[PDB]
């Protein structure tokens, strides 16, 4: 149907805007601490601690499959990256600190992304 196409075009444009958002958030992680999944070879107990692992490569796979239907779903995954790290790692660690800085800096990006998603529809 023509309606299905129009919906598909909206999803494609959302995916475009989320790719730009993703790039901007990932630049706020210059140490690349959140770039890839925590390795279960190197952290064998991880899944005893963290039930829903997340990382920027995993988000990019979902994005490129157009697997984010709305900004809320994308923000959920970003919050998992931060929140998982802040639980697994202690306050005095470079990991925890990196997550705090990513959260604080990402907030600014996400605030305007929400406006753009609402604005463009």
């Amino acid at each position: 149907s023509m309606e299905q196409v129009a919906m598909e075009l909206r999803l494609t444009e959302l995916t475009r805007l989320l790719r730009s958002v993703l790039d901007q958030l990932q630049d706020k992680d210059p140490a690349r601490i959140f770039a890839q999944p925590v390795s279960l070879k190197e952290v064998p107990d991880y899944l005893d601690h963290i039930k829903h692992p997340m990382d920027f490569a995993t988000m990019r796979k979902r994005l490129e499959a157009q697997g984010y239907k709305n900004l809320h779903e994308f923000e959920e995954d970003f919050d998992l990256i931060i929140d998982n790290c802040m639980k697994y790692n202690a306050r005095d660690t470079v990991f925890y600190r990196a997550a705090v800085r990513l959260r604080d800096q990402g907030g600014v990006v996400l605030r305007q992304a929400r406006r753009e998603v609402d604005s463009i529809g």
Side-chain angles (χ1 to χ4, degrees), residues 1-2 4-6 8 11-15 17-40 42-60 62-68 70-110 112-119 121:
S1 77
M2 199 44 240
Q4 287 301 312
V5 169
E8 290 164 0
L11 177 60
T12 296
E13 281 305 291
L14 175 70
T15 304
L17 175 164
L18 299 180
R19 191 179 302 115
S20 171
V21 175
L22 185 65
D23 287 347
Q24 282 180 68
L25 296 173
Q26 191 157 22
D27 289 337
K28 308 314 181 164
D29 173 31
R32 297 192 73 82
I33 292 166
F34 306 104
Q36 295 289 333
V38 170
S39 174
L40 306 173
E42 303 169 358
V43 189
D45 74 357
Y46 190 65
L47 298 181
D48 294 341
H49 293 264
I50 298 301
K51 295 292 162 182
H52 294 102
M54 193 46 55
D55 66 275
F56 286 126
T58 302
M59 293 190 59
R60 196 173 291 282
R62 181 161 169 194
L63 182 60
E64 289 316 325
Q66 303 188 344
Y68 297 115
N70 55 52
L71 180 56
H72 182 73
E73 287 186 350
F74 177 95
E75 294 171 303
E76 284 193 345
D77 269 356
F78 178 65
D79 287 335
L80 280 175
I81 289 174
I82 297 320
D83 293 339
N84 288 346
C85 182
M86 293 175 71
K87 295 167 187 72
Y88 189 81
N89 304 107
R91 225 158 19 252
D92 72 333
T93 64
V94 64
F95 309 106
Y96 184 112
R97 291 162 170 283
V100 166
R101 293 166 59 84
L102 177 65
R103 190 198 58 189
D104 286 351
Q105 295 193 278
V108 181
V109 174
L110 292 168
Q112 198 54 43
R114 161 59 59 205
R115 293 188 69 82
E116 285 173 345
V117 170
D118 293 358
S119 193

